Amino acid sequence: TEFIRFSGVVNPRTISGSNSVPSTQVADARIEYVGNGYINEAQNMGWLQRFFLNLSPM
Amino acid sequence: ERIRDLTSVQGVRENSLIGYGLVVGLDGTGDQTTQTPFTTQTLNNMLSQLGITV
Amino acid sequence: ERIRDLTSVQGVRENSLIGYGLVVGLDGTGDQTTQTPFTTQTLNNMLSQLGITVPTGTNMQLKNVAAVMVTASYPPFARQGQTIDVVVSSMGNAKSLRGGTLLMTPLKGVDSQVYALAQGNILVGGVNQLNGGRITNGAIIERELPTQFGAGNTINLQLNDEDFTMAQQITDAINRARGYGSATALDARTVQVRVPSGNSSQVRFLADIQNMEVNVTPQDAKVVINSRTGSVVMNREVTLDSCAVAQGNLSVTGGSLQSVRSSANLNSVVRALNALGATPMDLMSILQSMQSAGCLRAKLEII
Amino acid sequence: ERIRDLTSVQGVRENSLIGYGLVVGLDGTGDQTTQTPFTTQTLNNMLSQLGITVPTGTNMQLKNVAAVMVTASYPPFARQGQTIDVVVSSMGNAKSLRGGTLLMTPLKGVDSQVYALAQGNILVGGVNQLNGGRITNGAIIERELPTQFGAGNTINLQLNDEDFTMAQQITDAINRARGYGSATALDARTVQVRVPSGNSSQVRFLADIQNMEVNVTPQDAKVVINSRTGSVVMNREVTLDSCAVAQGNLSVTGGSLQSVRSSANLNSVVRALNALGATPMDLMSILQSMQSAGCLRAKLEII
Numbered sequence A: 001t002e003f004i005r006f007s008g009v010v011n012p013r014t015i016s017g018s019n020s021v022p023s024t025q026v027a028d029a030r031i032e033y034v035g036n037g038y039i040n041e042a043q044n045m046g047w048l049q050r051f052f053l054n055l056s057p058m
Numbered sequence B: 001e002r003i004r005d006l007t008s009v010q011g012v013r014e015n016s017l018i019g020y021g022l023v024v025g026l027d028g029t030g031d032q033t034t035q036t037p038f039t040t041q042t043l044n045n046m047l048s049q050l051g052i053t054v
Numbered sequence C, D: 001e002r003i004r005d006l007t008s009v010q011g012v013r014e015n016s017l018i019g020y021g022l023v024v025g026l027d028g029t030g031d032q033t034t035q036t037p038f039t040t041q042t043l044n045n046m047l048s049q050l051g052i053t054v055p056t057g058t059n060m061q062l063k064n065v066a067a068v069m070v071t072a073s074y075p076p077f078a079r080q081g082q083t084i085d086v087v088v089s090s091m092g093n094a095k096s097l098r099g100g101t102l103l104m105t106p107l108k109g110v111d112s113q114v115y116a117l118a119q120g121n122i123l124v125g126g127v128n129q130l131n132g133g134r135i136t137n138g139a140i141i142e143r144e145l146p147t148q149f150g151a152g153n154t155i156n157l158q159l160n161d162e163d164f165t166m167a168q169q170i171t172d173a174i175n176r177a178r179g180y181g182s183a184t185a186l187d188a189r190t191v192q193v194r195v196p197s198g199n200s201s202q203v204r205f206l207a208d209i210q211n212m213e214v215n216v217t218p219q220d221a222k223v224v225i226n227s228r229t230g231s232v233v234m235n236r237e238v239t240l241d242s243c244a245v246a247q248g249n250l251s252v253t254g255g256s257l258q259s260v261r262s263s264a265n266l267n268s269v270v271r272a273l274n275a276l277g278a279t280p281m282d283l284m285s286i287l288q289s290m291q292s293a294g295c296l297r298a299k300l301e302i303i
Helices: A037-041 A047-055 B037-050 C037-050 C164-177 C199-210 C266-274 C280-293 D037-050 D164-177 D199-210 D266-274 D280-293
Strands: A002-009 A027-035 C007-009 C015-024 C066-074 C083-090 C101-108 C114-121 C132-141 C154-159 C183-187 C190-194 C222-226 C231-234 C243-246 C257-260 C299-302 D007-009 D015-024 D066-074 D083-090 D101-108 D114-121 D132-141 D154-159 D183-187 D190-194 D222-226 D231-233 D243-247 D257-260 D299-302
Touching: A027 A037, B037 C015, C015 C037, C015 C083, C015 C114, C037 C066, C037 D015, C066 C101, C066 C114, C066 C132, C083 C114, C101 C132, C101 D015, C101 D066, C114 D015, C154 C164, C164 C183, C164 C190, C199 D164, C199 D183, C222 C280, C222 D280, C231 C280, C231 D280, C243 C280, C266 D243, C266 D257, C280 C299, C280 D243, D015 D037, D015 D083, D015 D114, D037 D066, D066 D101, D066 D114, D066 D132, D083 D114, D101 D132, D154 D164, D164 D183, D164 D190, D222 D280, D231 D280, D243 D280, D280 D299
Parallel strands: C222 C299, D222 D299
Antiparallel strands: A002 A027, C007 C154, C015 C066, C015 C101, C066 C083, C083 C132, C101 C114, C114 C132, C154 C190, C183 C190, C222 C231, C231 D243, C243 C257, D007 D154, D015 D066, D015 D101, D066 D083, D083 D132, D101 D114, D114 D132, D154 D190, D183 D190, D222 D231, D243 D257
């Protein structure tokens, strides 16, 4: 499953006549696009590789 | 009759006030909006304040 | 008869209301919708509120619809249900508003809140203006404004024109009519009147005050020139000294210099000026140069 | 005869109703359906409600159908089954509504709820307007609005124009007709009247009040100018001082300055102004400059 979440504050005079606002006009925007399932599990780094990335000498 | 026609009182004075506005209801005698962009811009501002978003 | 014709009551004032609307029923005199997109956009908004959802993209050419602005005056102490007159003025490129009908229009003030709803028929005289009209009792008040009237014990009367002498005369008239400490002059267009508490007592006091008669003292001598309309109006207090006047294409009925004697009465001033035999267009330049020379005594105002 | 011609009862007010409909039976004077898609779309909606499902995509050119807007006034205390008149105005690019017939049309207020159904025949006078008409008893009320009338013990009378003196006169007339504590003046266009409880007692009290006679006090002097229709109307209280008037292409019947004497009566003002011998178009500029100079005493309003 895929999740799209949006939050923000929008000035009411910036709304167009088709009741549509572009996202660049929204103040204090929060945009999230995440997923789950094994497709999302296949894009996470393993724990030993994460520790080797964080704690390598170089 | 003579003092009021020759002198003025201290602290009693007029001032000047200025503003910008629009005139509607003309019979085709308005300005060319293709050459004056401020007329269309302020009309859009007035409509957006009223609630119309062109 | 004199107090109500010279002063205004504090807290009693009008306001302005504006709104946007549409006029239908025109005989092909509406604006070009291809050049004004707001007419078609607001028509789609009205239809969508009513329940009709037109598709977008398709062109609409209309001849019977005109976008208008509606202006109105909010009266003092207004109650909901009362009727006021409105003025309807066309915006855009409409031809005429002859026999039109105005739909529902909210009338808002500067606080962006509604105060009246307007709907009616536009009356055009039918030269005469064609893009402007007036509707009698075309709007209904629907929001009341709270007032501070009734509270307190003092009320200020505000003069239309500033004068210490006129304010003193008004204060003396109220004092000799009602009582000793009835009124107090604050400044040249503000007189404070003491009234008892309660709404009924203040209403009765104002009804007795407003119909009083007060002699009007002589005012400042002033000459008003309107060059746009070509009019010159003088005052009863205007006087003149003796001077000499020279003007192009003018002569004594035979030299070029014409002598004007000193005049105190207004009729003498009119007689002396008509002895020159000049047009009002030339008289404006004559009066301006006379005021610069100091022979003219009144103050000159150009409106 | 005087109370009903000067005041209104609180809670007794009209409303506005609007709706959208179609007119059929025209003699080829309908709007161009190729430029107005809402006419064909609403016709398809009407046929689909009736039971006819036309296919989409195919063009329809009509000459006898016109899209219209219907306006109506909701009367106070309205009951279902009563009839009101409606005004039908054409929208789009229709030619004329001569001999048309209006189909069923819901009439909704600002609350987006129905209140009346309209159907009838449009009467056009047949210059005269062709895209507007009026139907007598063309709509039937079908929703009643609850009222607060009958409850309480006080009722407010609202004046058409604000005046402390007129409100005091109305209160004194009611007090000398009915009793001591019958009425109380609140403000310049609001008078509170005490009434007994019950609907029948209040109806009887209002029937006795509304036909009373009350003398009308002199009002404020006011001069109204309508430049769009070219009319100037003065008042009975307008007075004049002595001044001098100069105007282009005007002269004494021979100088350019014309003297106007001070006038108190209205007939003297009319005689003094007709001595100038000016057109009303020039008289507007003369009156405006006279009010700026202070020789004119009435307040000037430009409608």
